Amino acid sequence: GAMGQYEGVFYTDGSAIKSPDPTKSNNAGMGIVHATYKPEYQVLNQWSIPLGNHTAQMAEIAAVEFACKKALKIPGPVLVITDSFYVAESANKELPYWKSNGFVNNKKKPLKHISKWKSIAECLSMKPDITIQHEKGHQPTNTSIHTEGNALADKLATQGSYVVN
């Protein structure tokens, strides 16, 4: 109804693991889940992107950029949901809002991670059809359709950590 009809939905997740050896290093991975609005809710496919020299914060923002390009790539509009509101609202408003200030957040401090936002700006610049949403945590209500994607994305993110050590 109000949601409308989109080609599908993209759920991204980010996780990181700390070890005693890599004191100044952590293992993080990204998990993306694709869903559809057909008459039967089902994941079209799963995506895992293990990071080597990245951090949990970078895995969360990188997860939104990943589906971001894959979302617009589709010949139709897609919805992208993330477990971080900052990153989500980032490509949702900061992306276009920062461009107005020349990729700058406030005059007091410059925009951070501009390179990461620059890549997402190239996709969102092609068309706002890319919708961004922020997960409400894990199992926020007795029943939730978005929560299901969070479970599949959580497993993909954990598998990314096993890909690197």
Is 21 annotated to bind a ligand? Reply is: no
Q: Give dist(CA 148, CA 13) in Å, integer.
A: 12
Q: Is 136 exposed, middle or buried (0-12, 13-18, 19+ CB in 10 A)?
A: middle
Is 13 annotated to bind a ligand? Reply is: yes
Residue 19: count of CB within 10 angstroms of its CB: 10
**Is there a contact between 104 and 112 (Cβ–Cβ < 8 Å)?**
no
Is 83 annotated to bind a ligand? Reply is: yes
CB neighbours of 69 closer than 8 A, spacing ≥ 6? 119, 120, 123
Helix (H, G, I), strand (E, B) or coil at 76: coil
Tokens of 105: 């957040």
Which positions make up the binding site?
13, 60, 83, 154
Which positions make up the binding site for Mg(2+)?
13, 60, 83, 154
